[PDB]
Symmetry: C2
Subunit: 374 residues, 2 copies
Amino acid sequence: LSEKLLEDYKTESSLFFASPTRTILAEGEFTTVKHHEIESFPELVQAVLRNAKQAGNPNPIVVGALPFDRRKEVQLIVPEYSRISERLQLDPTLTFEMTPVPDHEVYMKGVKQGIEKIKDGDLKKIVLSRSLDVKSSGKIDKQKLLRELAEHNKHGYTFAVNLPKDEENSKTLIGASPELLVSRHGMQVISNPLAGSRPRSDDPVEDKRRAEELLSSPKDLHEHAVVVEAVAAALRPYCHTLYVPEKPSVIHSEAMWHLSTEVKGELKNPNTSSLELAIALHPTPAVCGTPMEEAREAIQKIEPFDREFFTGMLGWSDLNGDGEWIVTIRCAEVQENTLRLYAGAGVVAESKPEDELAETSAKFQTMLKALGLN
Amino acid sequence: ELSEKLLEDYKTESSLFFASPTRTILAEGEFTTVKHHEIESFPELVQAVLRNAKQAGNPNPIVVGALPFDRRKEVQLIVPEYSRISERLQLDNLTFEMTPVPDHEVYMKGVKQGIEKIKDGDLKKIVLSRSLDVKSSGKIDKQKLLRELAEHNKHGYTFAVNLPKDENSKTLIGASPELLVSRHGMQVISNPLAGSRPRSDDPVEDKRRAEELLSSPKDLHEHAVVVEAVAAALRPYCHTLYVPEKPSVIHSEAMWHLSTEVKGELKNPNTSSLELAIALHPTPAVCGTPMEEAREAIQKIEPFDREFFTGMLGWSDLNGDGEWIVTIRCAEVQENTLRLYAGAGVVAESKPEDELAETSAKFQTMLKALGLN
């Protein structure tokens, strides 16, 4: 059935979302709700979901994507219907025109600006990113793109979400993120911050060497620890007790090794929805920095493009408050014949411009491989 | 007077300017936007969203906006970030290219097809309409267009609604004479208009036309049909209705209209103005009998989409009160282009040429405001 759901994905589906706990296909937009203030959005969403129940939807969910920038308007959709199966089980089965935005040198310049700002003590952490515009000579087949991603993403979250357009052709957010922002199942809360990276190698000896190096890198370990501390501080008020592992683990996608910690807690209040928790966490320092509003102003000033939905959050939440929200990375906006791909790299005082550029390239591979351009 | 200041403060970004005989509203921003697929279950969602807006802040928040002619489309309204509401208003060179879409023949072709289908007993009443694209040499000053409409519309409903964009700002602007429905406590009022004649600058001829409309059997009969449909829609919601025996005549600067004020007293305090509007929308005055059949004929014959024209627009509050108007004598304005609209009810005994003239007379409200009267 799960593979049926992947086969049934159309550009009028509102969400495909393949996680390790399930696969969801949501069709249509029965209700869309937009709101000016992220902080008061969870209560509006619950009111909309209650209405949906009482108007005769037996399992109302919201699905969609929220932007990187918390100050922007937010929006989610209650679909007409949704199907929910077990997780996906799969055996692997033109001119393109590239325009980097910005070019490699302007990106590196921006990286020097971030370093400087930290060396003056204005910021502790900064993640700087860049994008890549791809024009195809044919119309991109979203459903095939989605399948390529799913087949090559055993452990993360494969997704497609319909996004706000003008009435232009449909705009879809598509990708394969390794990173859970938060989930809620019953009263159990889990968040999985990822911070620290090395690219995979096809040489199995080198591949393992890089996992070991990441796992013993003082700069990466310390920086990971700081991201974990911030996730734990944001979840602590909502929970009885928090379990925060003393040691990170190494996880992988096909393209990258990542340091990873699963932070787990039991809620105090059964009405605290997964959405509320996602909003309490968003954006984590892994995609933004510390202090967030300062890292964000630095980010907004240095980056010559709008991240829009990249490094935002996306997922679903139900009437009981259960849900899953992922950090939106290893992804692309797809519209007709064009895509915008995105990638970013954590920057610190010690950082080196070329290495950071190299890291963004290694991170682009998830999407480029799905397009046959790796 | 605050009312006039609200008209002066109107901006292209404002979600709603709405000047009615009971109040003037200027609504800014978008605290919450709600969009829904099924018009029939929209009222309850809208109340859910208004309740939430209260729980977050002000005691009796409102929704504002415009819904389309075609009831099967997605519908959308906005709870504004803030609104000022005052008493009713008490108010005291660019070149233009014009293009009829369709042209005057294609439109009369359409009306013939319409007469044809009523004579075969498929339809009883059909409204057919056309539009008039306009290109300006400059950017249209929307605020000034709004003031012109308001000044020349003492008795109607003058509005500017920010519409879902194409990229450049899109505004629905107009001065409608027709209340679809209001609610005030348990009191409901609808004012169907059906039957018209253009005003004349010769006051003897002006009065003659009024008197002729008021006693035309064809027009009285068609008016009584519209009145029956209003009553029909309202009956299930009211313990009592007052339906006047006969219509009066009312005027805008452009037109005489046959008018009936239908009043009711609701059974249920929780019935919102928006819910009544939906029960009424669209009336046979702009669509036809049967509605589903005549709308099919309308979609099939008309070479443009009406979109918001002959839709409904207005406001509703958390208590349930509100005012919704029939969106006529209006235009979509974008940058330096307007699309003006006008329509004319068609029956078996209709004459194609008289409907073309009737529609051109209906265009005068908007044309006059542009200085093209």
